């Protein structure tokens, strides 16, 4: 399984999508996914949450005509989601973030 800062966001630069680990969250809502029993290794078994639309709300990552934003979890084994993601640009910018969305750090 790839997923580490590095390892996801050396993935996404080459094959330009996610690992094979992730699925969406209307996918995990599918296989049974409820956030609130923190099940989602139960039902998709290594499986992690990514791919879905990161909207940016707050404008805390950059903004350009154009630019839509996707997210993924980082280091999710199991029971209740952690707190770190990997946030990319439509023109693969890439930043992390450790405190669930509080700040970033561009990492390529």
Known sequence: VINTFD??????IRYKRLPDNYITKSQASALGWVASKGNLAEVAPGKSIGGDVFSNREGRLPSASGRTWRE?????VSGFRNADRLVYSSDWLIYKTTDNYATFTRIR
């Not at 993924?72 to 999710?76: G, M, P, S, T």
């Open 7 to 12: 390892g996801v966001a050396d993935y996404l």
């Open 72 to 76: 993924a979890d980082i280091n999710y």
